[PDB]
DNA sequence: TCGGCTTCGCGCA
DNA sequence: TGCGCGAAGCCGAT
């Protein structure tokens, strides 16, 4: 569909039918950004051609009574400020709210629209509006994978057991879809309040906010500002300060030296591509780029494989073979504790470092990347059944994450619980051949009381 | 039918 | 601290 710095392969037609007289509609869910989308830019480049104007809506479901106010709070500031950036370009911006399946198909009769475009994600939920929206249009809908570097599809075709699989098929790929992103041009042709939506869903998950003793909110707001713009400066620091230590301290939960990129990334407020075209571009040690470049490519975007091709992503089904039979002979094991999801979600279990890493949890909503995995490891080892803990780490990690109700958090959980894209390790008591992390491996990688003392 | 697996623990300088 | 081995099942190159 016309365009000359524009790789086909990134969209796929998800209904085909006759192109409508009026405005191109570009259906922005996962990727909240107007700087470095493929799917706008997909949508500016059609809305071109039919000498048509393009306009993006938002559909606010009622899913954000699930999570709480850190995440309601983060994605509103992000699409105020969003919306002020599409207006400069003439672009106007509509906020629905109810079922995506009714308003867009609503929308697009009421205005008229010819064509029909949505960035891609792999999620359950999105899959099945895409299939209401596609029974209530009659007009040419599209989707567009304006997430991953390569497209889901295109990376691969079905699901891919382990990373050392899945790396040479990216690698291969990355000098055809590793390119830079034009400039999004203005439209040409012109034809719900975000302070209503963000003051009705604050007081509607008032009741429901994290209090400690004296009715003080746990959540620290000022850690991560919201936005386009505030994702830009995140990853100008990284590059500058943090980058070239990041190879040898990432597992150091003590140092602040991750890039901090995952409420940003998750929420589509900077672009993955953009990312990995500035860090491919610096001059830094070639360990750390690797290191790097790995977490965001490789084992990002194998996250969305995982979740394409197995819709049971979130269950004990999806676990490998070997897995489910080790988990499955363990169930019998005597647990030498066993926690309810009120007390793991209140931190009050006998492991300091695991009730730290919970209260870094609760305080700033991004928990780092090495504890995350000790963390999810001993709820499996400290639960009834691996059942029962795989759905306490994923409430725990979709209710308190800003990047969590994501693709990485269901593979990250599944890779911790269940071996996925893993292998098989000790034969144990509880966990079975399930890879094993303890309180004494985590003291001689880093200073663990540092890392306790700073969160209680 | 071998090689090597994100990210393990553990003994040893 | 950083290094090498152990423990374990399987994909994918042939
Ligand atoms: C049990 C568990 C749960 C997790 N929960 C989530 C989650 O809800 N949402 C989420 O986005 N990620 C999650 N992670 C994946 C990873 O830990 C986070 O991406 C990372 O902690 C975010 O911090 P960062 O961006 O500063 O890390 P960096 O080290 O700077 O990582 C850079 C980017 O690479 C990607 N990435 C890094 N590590 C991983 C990984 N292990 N798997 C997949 N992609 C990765 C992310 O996009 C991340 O932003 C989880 C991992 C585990 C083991």
């Given at each position: 569909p016309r365009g000359s710095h524009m790789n086909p392969k990134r969209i796929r037609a998800l209904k085909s039918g006759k192109q409508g007289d009026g405005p191109v509609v570009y259906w922005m869910?996962?990727?909240?950004?107007?700087?470095?989308?493929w799917a706008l830019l997909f949508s500016r480049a059609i809305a071109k051609e039919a000498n048509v104007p393009v306009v993006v809506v938002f559909c606010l479901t009622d899913?954000?009574?699930?999570?709480?106010i850190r995440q309601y709070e983060f994605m509103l500031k992000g699409l105020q400020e969003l919306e002020v950036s599409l207006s400069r370009k003439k672009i106007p911006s509509f906020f629905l709210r109810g079922d995506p399946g009714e308003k867009i198909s609503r929308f697009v009769k009421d205005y008229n629209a010819g064509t029909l475009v949505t960035d891609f994600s792999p999620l359950r939920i999105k899959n099945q509006w895409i299939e209401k929206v596609i029974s209530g249009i009659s007009i040419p809908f599209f989707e567009v994978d304006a997430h991953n570097v390569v497209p889901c599809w295109e990376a691969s075709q079905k699901h891919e057991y382990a990373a050392h699989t899945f790396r040479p098929k990216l690698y291969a790929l990355l000098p055809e879809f590793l390119e830079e992103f034009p400039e999004l041009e203005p439209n040409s042709v012109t034809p719900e309040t975000l302070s209503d939506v963000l003051e009705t869903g604050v007081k509607a998950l008032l009741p429901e906010r994290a209090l400690?003793?004296?009715?003080?909110?746990?959540?620290?707001?000022?850690?991560f500002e919201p936005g386009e713009k505030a994702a830009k400066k995140v990853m100008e620091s990284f590059i500058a300060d943090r980058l070239d230590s990041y190879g040898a301290?990432?597992?150091?939960?003590?140092?602040?030296?991750?890039?901090?990129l995952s409420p940003y990334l998750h929420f589509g407020q900077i672009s993955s591509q953009r990312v990995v075209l500035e860090v491919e571009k610096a001059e830094s040690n070639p360990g750390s780029k690797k290191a790097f470049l790995d977490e965001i490519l490789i084992w990002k975007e194998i996250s969305d494989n995982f979740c394409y091709y197995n819709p049971?992503?979130?269950?004990?089904?999806?676990?490998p073979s070997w897995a489910k039979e080790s988990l499955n002979a363990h169930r019998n094991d005597v647990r030498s504790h066993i926690y309810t999801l009120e007390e793991f979600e209140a931190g009050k279990t006998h492991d300091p470092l695991w009730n730290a890493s919970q209260m870094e949890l609760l305080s700033t909503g991004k928990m780092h990347g090495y504890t995350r995995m000790y963390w999810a490891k001993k709820i499996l080892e400290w639960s009834e059944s691996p059942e029962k803990a795989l759905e306490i780490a994923i409430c725990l990690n979709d209710r308190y994450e800003?990047?969590?109700?994501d693709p990485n958090g269901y593979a990250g959980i599944a890779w911790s619980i269940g071996g996925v894209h893993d292998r098989a390790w000790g034969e144990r008591e509880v966990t079975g051949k399930i890879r094993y992390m303890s309180y004494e491996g985590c003291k001689r990688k880093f200073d663990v009381k540092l890392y306790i003392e700073k969160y209680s």
């Open positions: 869910s996962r990727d909240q950004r107007a700087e470095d989308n899913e954000f009574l699930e999570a709480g400690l003793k004296n009715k003080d909110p746990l959540f620290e707001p000022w850690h301290l990432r597992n150091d939960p003590t140092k602040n030296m991750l890039s901090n049971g992503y979130d269950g004990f089904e999806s676990f800003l990047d969590g109700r």
